[PDB]
Each structure stands twice: as structure tokens, then as C-alpha cells.
């Protein structure tokens, strides 16, 4: 008593969700039974994220996640 | 929201100074480097040594 | 049409440090201190609305908060909408307002018509 429930909460301002495929390293790696390491995506030439941290490959560009470097 | 929120230039003006004990921005005594409110100066005046003579 | 004795066509290719000698002192000093980072991106938006506009059609209305934007002579004809605190009001840029601010064309208040006086 001494209130009304008022049912006036509207939080419908949807945020994102982190869609990760199951072990996205399989999206990153592809190895044949002889033992070849085929990195299917580009490697960023930055000093902080060189030789281990892989880029993105979009429909028209390359793209980093650490320093967000971009190509064509 | 990094080049944002505390972004606006507070390099002068009324709302870049606040009292040093109230953290309030109105009625401020900047003279001689006091930087107190006009109300909080009157509480701590005899501690600072400002005696009321005449 | 002219402005301080020079037509608009020479104003379209009048350079940055030479157009400044035609303006009044607020606008000349404003172009001396520079146009900032969020004011270069408005003129780029008006270029992007101009060269994609049809050749017989004025460009679409574009919404701004930049009431301090000086009306440059390379900004004539555009449909900008400068805010008034409540709404974005539609502004069409004519060549005779090329030394004013953008924020003196959305009025910020309702021009007052009085009623009957109450208890004074």
C-alpha cells in the first residue's frame, strides 16, 4: 500500500551482444596434416601488435583491432 | 566518450574554481590565496589568524 | 550581385587569407584564430550534399548545432538547419548573408504577444 506499481519502465534501448563463433582461432587458422600454418588473414605490421596479432579482412579492406590500421 | 565527457574547456570562469573545503562555487574569496567560500572563511577565520579588531 | 565591390564568382575562388580582408572584425578575427575540428567537418558535409545533389535541385536539409558557423561565400545555396534549442529550423542560404552567423536565423524565442494583466 501507499504506492502504485505504474508499469511505466521502458528500458527497450537494446545494447549489443558479442557474437563469437566456437573457438574463432579456427576462423583464424587452417592446418593441413603435413603441418602448414596458413594464416588466412593479414598480420598487422605495427610495433605493438606485430607478428602475432592478426588483422581483420573485411569486404574491401584490412582492419586491425589494436591500432585500427586500415588498407584497401 | 574519451574525447568527450570531461572535454569542455574549464580554463577560467566561474565554474573552474570551487571552495577548498565546501567544494562549492558561489561566494568565493580568492584574495591573498584563500580560495574559500564566504561562509567557510567565517568559520575558520580565527584559526587562520584574521582577528576582528574594528 | 557583389560584396565590397567584388562579385560572388571571384568569392568562390577567393583564397583563405584574402577573403579575410573583406570581412568585418569579428569574422576576420575568427578566421585568424582558425576554424576548429568540428567546423571543417560541416563544410565537408555541405560539399557531400552539393556534388550529390541533382543539377536542377537544391540539396537536402542538413541538421546542425553550429550556430557560430560564419556564412562563407563557398556555402551559398545550401539548405542547413540550425537548432533553436527546441527544433531544427530550415535555413536557405542566400548570397546577401555572407558575413553573418548561422545562429541568427533560428529565432530562439516566441515573439511576445501580451494577454490581460493579472494582479499586478
Amino acid at each position: 500500500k501507499k504506492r502504485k506499481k505504474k508499469s511505466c519502465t521502458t528500458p527497450k534501448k537494446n545494447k549489443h551482444k558479442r557474437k563469437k563463433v566456437k573457438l574463432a582461432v579456427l576462423k583464424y587458422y587452417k592446418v593441413d596434416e603435413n603441418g602448414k600454418i596458413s594464416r588466412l588473414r593479414r598480420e598487422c605490421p605495427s610495433d605493438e601488435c606485430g607478428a602475432g596479432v592478426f588483422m581483420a579482412s573485411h569486404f574491401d579492406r584490412h582492419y586491425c583491432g589494436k591500432c585500427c590500421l586500415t588498407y584497401c | 566518450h574519451q574525447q568527450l565527457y570531461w572535454s569542455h574547456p574549464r580554463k577560467f570562469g566561474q565554474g573552474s574554481r570551487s571552495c577548498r573545503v565546501c567544494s562549492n562555487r558561489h561566494g568565493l574569496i580568492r584574495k591573498y590565496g584563500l580560495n574559500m567560500c564566504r561562509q567557510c572563511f567565517r568559520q575558520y577565520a580565527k584559526d587562520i589568524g584574521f582577528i576582528k579588531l574594528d | 550581385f557583389t560584396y565590397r565591390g567584388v562579385d560572388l564568382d571571384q568569392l568562390l575562388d577567393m583564397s583563405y587569407e584574402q577573403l579575410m580582408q573583406l570581412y568585418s572584425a569579428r569574422q576576420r578575427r575568427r578566421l585568424n584564430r582558425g576554424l576548429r575540428r568540428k567546423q571543417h567537418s560541416l563544410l565537408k558535409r555541405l560539399r557531400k550534399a552539393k556534388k550529390e545533389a541533382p543539377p536542377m535541385e537544391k540539396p537536402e536539409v542538413v541538421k546542425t548545432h553550429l550556430r557560430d558557423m560564419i556564412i562563407l561565400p563557398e556555402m551559398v545555396g545550401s539548405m542547413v538547419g540550425v537548432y533553436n534549442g527546441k527544433t531544427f529550423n530550415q535555413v536557405e542560404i542566400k548570397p546577401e548573408m555572407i558575413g553573418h552567423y548561422l545562429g541568427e536565423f533560428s529565432i530562439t524565442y516566441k515573439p511576445v504577444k501580451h494577454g490581460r494583466p493579472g494582479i499586478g
Binding site: - | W6, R20, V21, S23 | -
Partner: protein
Amino acid sequence: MPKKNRIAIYELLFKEGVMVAKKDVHMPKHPELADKNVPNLHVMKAMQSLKSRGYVKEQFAWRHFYWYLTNEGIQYLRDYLHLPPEIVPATLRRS
């Protein structure tokens, strides 16, 4: 807050047992912990986390925050950063 912030705030707590602040969320970095780039908001909210558990003891002032360390808070830093008791903080140094 990342690991190199939350760890590095706890490091100088065990060294002398006290920590001061400013109640200044908007400060770029805490002045005692230079060369780390930890903001004052980070150390402020870290000690707000530590006070509700009971490891520190809060006291305020004109504008600054003050924090001492309780007896059950010394052990919470002793196992979080793995120190032996053969070394001592500034408790038993003079007299």
C-alpha cells in the same frame, strides 16, 4: 580497471599502510603513482571496494580522502601479492 592499475594501487598500500586521495574523479592521474597513468577515479573506486569489505578504514577531511589499514586487511594484501611475513611494513621500524 585493468590489472596493472588494480595491482599497482595495492602495491603502495602494503608499503606504508596509508593512502590519500582528492575526491577528484576528473583528475588525469594520481600524483603518488606517476609513471603508471592510474587516474584518481581508479584508486578512489578501488578503495571504495576495499572499505565495504573492512580491509581499510576511511576518514574524510576538507576535500581529501584518507585510508588506514586494519589488521585483517594486512593479510588480504599478504596473499593477493604473495609476500612472506619475514619482511615488515612501517609498523615496527621506529621504537
